[PDB]
mmCIF file of C-alpha atoms and ligand atoms in Angstrom:
data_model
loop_
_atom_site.group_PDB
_atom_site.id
_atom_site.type_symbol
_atom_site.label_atom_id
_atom_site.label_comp_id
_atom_site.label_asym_id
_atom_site.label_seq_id
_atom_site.Cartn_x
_atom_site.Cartn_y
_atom_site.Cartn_z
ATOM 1 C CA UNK A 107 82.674 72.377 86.419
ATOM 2 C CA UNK A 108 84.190 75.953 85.632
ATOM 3 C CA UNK A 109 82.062 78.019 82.869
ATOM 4 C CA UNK A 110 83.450 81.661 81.964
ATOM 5 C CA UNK A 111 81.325 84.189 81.266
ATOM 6 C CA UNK A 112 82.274 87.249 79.238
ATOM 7 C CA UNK A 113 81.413 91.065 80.693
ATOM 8 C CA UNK A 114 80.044 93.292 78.064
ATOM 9 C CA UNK A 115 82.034 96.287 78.639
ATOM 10 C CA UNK A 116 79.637 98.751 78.715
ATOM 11 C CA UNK A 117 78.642 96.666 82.179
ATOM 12 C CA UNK A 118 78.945 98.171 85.681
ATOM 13 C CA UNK A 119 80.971 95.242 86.359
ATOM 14 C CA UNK A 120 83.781 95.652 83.845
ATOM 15 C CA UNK A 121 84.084 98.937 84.368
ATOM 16 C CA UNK A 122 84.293 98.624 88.297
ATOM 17 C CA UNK A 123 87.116 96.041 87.796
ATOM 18 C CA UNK A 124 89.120 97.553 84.850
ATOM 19 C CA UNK A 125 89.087 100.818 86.901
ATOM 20 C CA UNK A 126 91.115 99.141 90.238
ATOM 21 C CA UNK A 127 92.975 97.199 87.668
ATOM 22 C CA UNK A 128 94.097 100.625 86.260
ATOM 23 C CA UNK A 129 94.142 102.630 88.881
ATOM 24 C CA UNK A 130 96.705 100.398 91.208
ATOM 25 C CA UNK A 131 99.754 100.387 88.494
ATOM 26 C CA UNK A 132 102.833 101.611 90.500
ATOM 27 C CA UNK A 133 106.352 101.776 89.646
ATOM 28 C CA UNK A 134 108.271 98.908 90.922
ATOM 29 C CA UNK A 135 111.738 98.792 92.603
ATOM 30 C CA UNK A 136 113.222 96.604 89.848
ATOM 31 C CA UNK A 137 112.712 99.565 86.943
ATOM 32 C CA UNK A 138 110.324 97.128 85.112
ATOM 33 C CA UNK A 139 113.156 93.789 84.753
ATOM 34 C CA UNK A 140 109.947 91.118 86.057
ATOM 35 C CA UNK A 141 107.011 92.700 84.665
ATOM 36 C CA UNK A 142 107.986 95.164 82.313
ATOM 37 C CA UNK A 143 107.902 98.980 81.162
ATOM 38 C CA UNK A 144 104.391 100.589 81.576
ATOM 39 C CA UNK A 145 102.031 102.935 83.192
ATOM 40 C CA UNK A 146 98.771 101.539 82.038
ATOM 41 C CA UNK A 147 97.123 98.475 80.392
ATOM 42 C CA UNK A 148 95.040 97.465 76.978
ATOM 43 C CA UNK A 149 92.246 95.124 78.760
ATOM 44 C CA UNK A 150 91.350 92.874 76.431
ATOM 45 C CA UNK A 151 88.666 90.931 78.037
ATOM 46 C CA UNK A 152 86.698 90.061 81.332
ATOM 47 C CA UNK A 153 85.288 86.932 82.704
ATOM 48 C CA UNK A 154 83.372 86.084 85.659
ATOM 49 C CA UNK A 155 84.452 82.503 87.384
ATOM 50 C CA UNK A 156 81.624 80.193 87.952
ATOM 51 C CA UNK A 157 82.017 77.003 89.766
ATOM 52 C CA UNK A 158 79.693 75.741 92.343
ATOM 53 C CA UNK A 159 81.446 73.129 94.245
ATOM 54 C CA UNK A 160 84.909 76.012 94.226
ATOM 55 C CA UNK A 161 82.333 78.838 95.270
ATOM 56 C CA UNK A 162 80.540 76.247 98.190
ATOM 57 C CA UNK A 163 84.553 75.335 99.062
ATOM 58 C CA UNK A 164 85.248 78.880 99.626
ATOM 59 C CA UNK A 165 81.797 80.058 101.281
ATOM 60 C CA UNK A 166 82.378 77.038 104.058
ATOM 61 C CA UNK A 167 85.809 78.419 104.884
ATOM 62 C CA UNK A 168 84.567 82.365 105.052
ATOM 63 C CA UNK A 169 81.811 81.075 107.377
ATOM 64 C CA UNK A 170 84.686 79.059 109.694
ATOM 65 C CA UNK A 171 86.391 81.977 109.893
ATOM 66 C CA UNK A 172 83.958 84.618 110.660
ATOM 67 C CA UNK A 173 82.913 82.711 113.541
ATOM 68 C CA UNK A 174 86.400 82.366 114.473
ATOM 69 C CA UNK A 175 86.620 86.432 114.338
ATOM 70 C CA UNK A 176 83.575 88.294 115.852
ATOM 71 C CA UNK A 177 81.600 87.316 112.880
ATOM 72 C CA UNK A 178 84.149 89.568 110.433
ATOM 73 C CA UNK A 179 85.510 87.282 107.214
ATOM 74 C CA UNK A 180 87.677 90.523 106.335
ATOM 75 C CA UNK A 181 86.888 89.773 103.125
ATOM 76 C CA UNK A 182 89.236 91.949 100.211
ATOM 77 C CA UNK A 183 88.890 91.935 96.426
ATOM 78 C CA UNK A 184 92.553 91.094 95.718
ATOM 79 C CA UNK A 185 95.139 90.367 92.187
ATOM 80 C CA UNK A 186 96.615 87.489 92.008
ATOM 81 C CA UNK A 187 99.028 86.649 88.943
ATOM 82 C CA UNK A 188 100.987 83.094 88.084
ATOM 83 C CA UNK A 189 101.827 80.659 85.595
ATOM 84 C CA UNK A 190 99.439 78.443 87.084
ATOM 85 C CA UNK A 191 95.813 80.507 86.424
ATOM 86 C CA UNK A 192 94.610 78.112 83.818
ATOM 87 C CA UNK A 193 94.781 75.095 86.751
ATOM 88 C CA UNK A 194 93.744 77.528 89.188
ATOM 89 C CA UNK A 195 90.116 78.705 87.608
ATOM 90 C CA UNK A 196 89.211 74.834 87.042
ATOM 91 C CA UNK A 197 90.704 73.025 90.400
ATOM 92 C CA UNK A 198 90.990 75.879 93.202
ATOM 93 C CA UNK A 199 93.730 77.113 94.944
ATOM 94 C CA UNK A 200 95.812 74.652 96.595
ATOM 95 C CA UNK A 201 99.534 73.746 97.939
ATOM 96 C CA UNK A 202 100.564 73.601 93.991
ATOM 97 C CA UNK A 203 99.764 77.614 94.069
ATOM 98 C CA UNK A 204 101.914 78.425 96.505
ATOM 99 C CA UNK A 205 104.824 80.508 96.542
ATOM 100 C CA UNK A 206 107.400 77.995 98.241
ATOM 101 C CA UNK A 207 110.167 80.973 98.480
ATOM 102 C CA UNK A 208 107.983 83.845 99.295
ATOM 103 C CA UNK A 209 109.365 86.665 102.352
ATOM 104 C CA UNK A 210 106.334 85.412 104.512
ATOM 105 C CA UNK A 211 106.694 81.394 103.934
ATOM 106 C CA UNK A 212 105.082 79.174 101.816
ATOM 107 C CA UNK A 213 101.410 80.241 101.335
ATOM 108 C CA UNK A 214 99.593 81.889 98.122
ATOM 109 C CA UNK A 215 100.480 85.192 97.571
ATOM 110 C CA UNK A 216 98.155 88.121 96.884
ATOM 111 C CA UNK A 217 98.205 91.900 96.107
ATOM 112 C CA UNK A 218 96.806 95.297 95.907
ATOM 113 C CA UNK A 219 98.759 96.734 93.298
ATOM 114 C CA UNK A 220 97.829 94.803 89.836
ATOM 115 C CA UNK A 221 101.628 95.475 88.641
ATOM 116 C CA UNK A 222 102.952 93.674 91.267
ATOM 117 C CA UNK A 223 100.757 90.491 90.574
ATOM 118 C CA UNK A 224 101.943 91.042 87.011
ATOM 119 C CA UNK A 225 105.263 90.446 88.194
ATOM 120 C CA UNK A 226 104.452 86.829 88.501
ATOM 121 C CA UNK A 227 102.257 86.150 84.949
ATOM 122 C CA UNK A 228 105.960 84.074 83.722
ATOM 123 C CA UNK A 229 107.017 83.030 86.885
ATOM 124 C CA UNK A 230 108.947 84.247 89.690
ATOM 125 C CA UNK A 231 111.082 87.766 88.392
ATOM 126 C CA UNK A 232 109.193 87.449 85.370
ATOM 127 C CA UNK A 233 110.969 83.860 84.494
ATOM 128 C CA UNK A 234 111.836 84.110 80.934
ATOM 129 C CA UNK A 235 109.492 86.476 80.123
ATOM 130 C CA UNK A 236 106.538 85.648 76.967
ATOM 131 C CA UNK A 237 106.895 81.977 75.620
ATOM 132 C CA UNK A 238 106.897 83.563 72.138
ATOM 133 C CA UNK A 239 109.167 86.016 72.131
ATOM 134 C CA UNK A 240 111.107 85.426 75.593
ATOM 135 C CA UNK A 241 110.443 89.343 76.655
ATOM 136 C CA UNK A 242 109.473 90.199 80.138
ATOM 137 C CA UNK A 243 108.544 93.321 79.192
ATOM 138 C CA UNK A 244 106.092 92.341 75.996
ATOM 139 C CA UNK A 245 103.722 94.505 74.570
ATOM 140 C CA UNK A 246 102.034 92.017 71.975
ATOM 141 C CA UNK A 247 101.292 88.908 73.727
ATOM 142 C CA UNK A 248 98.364 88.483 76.301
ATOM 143 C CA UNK A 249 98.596 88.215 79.698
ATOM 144 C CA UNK A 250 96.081 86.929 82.576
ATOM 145 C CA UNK A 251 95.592 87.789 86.413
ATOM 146 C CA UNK A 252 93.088 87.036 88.438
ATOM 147 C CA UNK A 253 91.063 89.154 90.237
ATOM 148 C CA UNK A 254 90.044 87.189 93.674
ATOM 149 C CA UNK A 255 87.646 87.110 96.499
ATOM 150 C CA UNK A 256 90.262 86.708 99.577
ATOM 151 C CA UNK A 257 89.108 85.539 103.554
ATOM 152 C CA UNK A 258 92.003 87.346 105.806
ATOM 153 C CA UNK A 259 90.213 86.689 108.791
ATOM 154 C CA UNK A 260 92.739 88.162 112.105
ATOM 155 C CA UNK A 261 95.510 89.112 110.003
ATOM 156 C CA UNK A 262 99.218 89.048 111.580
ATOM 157 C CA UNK A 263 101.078 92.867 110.497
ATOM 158 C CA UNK A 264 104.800 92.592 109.430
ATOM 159 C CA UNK A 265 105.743 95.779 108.879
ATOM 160 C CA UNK A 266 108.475 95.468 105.923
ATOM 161 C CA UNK A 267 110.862 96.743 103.116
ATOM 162 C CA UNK A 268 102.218 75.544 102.314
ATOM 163 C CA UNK A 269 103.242 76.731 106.200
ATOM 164 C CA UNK A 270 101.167 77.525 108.607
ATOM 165 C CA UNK A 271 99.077 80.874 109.347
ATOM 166 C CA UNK A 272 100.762 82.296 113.002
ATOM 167 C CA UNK A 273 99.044 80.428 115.583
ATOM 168 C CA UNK A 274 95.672 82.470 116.461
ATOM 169 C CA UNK A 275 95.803 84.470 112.826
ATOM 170 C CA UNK A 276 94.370 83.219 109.567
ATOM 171 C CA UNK A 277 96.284 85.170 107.124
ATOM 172 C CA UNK A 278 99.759 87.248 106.858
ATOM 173 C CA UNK A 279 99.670 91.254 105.902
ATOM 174 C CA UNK A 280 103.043 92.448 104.647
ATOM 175 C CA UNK A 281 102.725 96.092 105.203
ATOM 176 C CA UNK A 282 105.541 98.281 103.156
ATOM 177 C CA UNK A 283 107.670 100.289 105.767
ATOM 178 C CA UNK A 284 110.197 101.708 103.343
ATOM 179 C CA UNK A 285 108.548 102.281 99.579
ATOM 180 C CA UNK A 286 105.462 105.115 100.594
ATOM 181 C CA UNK A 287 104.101 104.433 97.071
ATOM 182 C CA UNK A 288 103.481 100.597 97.689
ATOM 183 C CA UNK A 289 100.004 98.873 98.716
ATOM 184 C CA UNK A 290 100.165 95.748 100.939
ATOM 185 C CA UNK A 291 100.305 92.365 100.167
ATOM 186 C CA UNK A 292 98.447 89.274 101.517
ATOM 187 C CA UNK A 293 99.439 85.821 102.079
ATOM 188 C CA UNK A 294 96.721 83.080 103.191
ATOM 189 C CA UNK A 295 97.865 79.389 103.974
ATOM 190 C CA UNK A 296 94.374 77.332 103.322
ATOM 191 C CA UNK A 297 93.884 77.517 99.198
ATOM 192 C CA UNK A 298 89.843 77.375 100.631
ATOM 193 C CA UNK A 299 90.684 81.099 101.539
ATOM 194 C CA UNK A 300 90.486 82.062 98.059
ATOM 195 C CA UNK A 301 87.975 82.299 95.325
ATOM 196 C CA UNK A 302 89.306 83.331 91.934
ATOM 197 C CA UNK A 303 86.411 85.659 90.497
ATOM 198 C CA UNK A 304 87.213 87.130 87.658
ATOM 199 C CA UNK A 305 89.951 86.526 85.247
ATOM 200 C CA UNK A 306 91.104 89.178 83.238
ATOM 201 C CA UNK A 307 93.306 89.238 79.796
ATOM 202 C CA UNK A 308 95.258 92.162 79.154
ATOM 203 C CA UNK A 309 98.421 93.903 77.139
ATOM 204 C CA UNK A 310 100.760 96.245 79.163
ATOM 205 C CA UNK A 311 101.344 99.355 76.690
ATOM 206 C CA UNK A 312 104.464 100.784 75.901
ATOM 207 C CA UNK A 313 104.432 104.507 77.300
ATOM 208 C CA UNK A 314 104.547 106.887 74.713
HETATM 209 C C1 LIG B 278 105.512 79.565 92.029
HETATM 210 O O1 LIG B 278 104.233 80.090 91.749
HETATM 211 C C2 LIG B 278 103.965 81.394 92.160
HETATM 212 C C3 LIG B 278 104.850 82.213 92.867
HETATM 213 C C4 LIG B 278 104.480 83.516 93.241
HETATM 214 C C5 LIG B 278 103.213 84.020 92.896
HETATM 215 C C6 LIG B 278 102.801 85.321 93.312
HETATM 216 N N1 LIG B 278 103.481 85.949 94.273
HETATM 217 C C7 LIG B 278 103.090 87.199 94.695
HETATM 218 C C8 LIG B 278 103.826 87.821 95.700
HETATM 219 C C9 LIG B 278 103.431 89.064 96.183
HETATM 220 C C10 LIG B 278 102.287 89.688 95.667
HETATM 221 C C11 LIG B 278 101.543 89.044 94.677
HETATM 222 C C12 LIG B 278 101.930 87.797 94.202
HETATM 223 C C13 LIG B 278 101.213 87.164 93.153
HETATM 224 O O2 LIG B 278 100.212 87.654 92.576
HETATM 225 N N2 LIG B 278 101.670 85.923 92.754
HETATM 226 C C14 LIG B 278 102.324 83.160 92.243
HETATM 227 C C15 LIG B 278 102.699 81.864 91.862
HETATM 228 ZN ZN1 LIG B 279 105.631 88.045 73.532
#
């Protein structure tokens, strides 16, 4: 029941979300080697998610936990990046989504900065990088995230360099305590949590 609908971009709404897109590129600890060489992206379009039964799924859970939190979802407009976003935009997030291995357990994985969710567009580290041309670092083909509608709900802080959420929390916040340029990352452990919003396609450019 998923239908995508294309922003014009002289829209509000384009603009508003190619602007945090762009504006929360960092440099990444790994000198590009997952997600490649860049400062900045070509966006090359973006769609608004629309599925009723996925949006009711999520509204039911943001209601649960607001009451469950002094009527505060701690709702966050969050990037989310994996081989899986085609399954993802029709089906939900579920158990499939998450990332089994990841420093805070198994649970889906979010971020602030877009380059670090485009770490994950091929897989883990980048995987193999394109299918074309086998290039973590391509500048030709296109690329997806997601930009998503996340419930944190009491959050539990690790401060640092599916399972379940820590009893009496409904999400995880890893907070970086060593790289000052870094923005936090979010991990939830219900897929319900989640709603993915838009979906964006994009190029990374080569700096010049
Ligand atoms: C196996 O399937 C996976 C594994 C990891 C990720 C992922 N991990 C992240 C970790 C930190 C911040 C953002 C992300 C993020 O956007 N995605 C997605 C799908
Ligand atoms: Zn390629």
């Amino acid at each position: 029941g998923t239908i995508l609908i294309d922003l014009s971009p002289d829209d509000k709404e384009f603009q508003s979300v190619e602007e945090e897109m762009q504006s929360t590129v960092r440099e990444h600890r790994d000198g590009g080697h997952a997600g490649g060489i860049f400062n900045r992206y070509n966006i090359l379009k973006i769609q608004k998610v629309c599925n009723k039964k996925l949006w009711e799924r999520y509204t039911h859970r943001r209601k649960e936990v607001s009451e469950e939190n002094h009527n505060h979802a701690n709702e966050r407009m969050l990037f989310h990046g994996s081989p899986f976003v085609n399954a993802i935009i029709h089906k939900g997030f579920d158990e499939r989504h998450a990332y089994i291995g990841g420093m805070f357990g198994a649970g889906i994985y979010f971020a602030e900065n877009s380059s670090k969710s485009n770490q994950y567009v091929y897989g883990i580290g980048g995987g193999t990088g394109c299918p074309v041309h086998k290039d973590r670092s391509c500048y030709i083909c296109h690329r997806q995230l997601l930009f998503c509608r996340v419930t944190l709900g009491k959050s539990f802080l690790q401060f640092s360099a599916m399972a379940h959420s820590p009893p009496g929390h409904h999400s995880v916040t890893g907070r970086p305590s060593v790289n000052g340029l870094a923005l936090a990352e979010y991990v939830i452990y219900r897929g319900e949590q989640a709603y993915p919003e838009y979906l964006i396609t994009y190029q990374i450019m080569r700096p010049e």
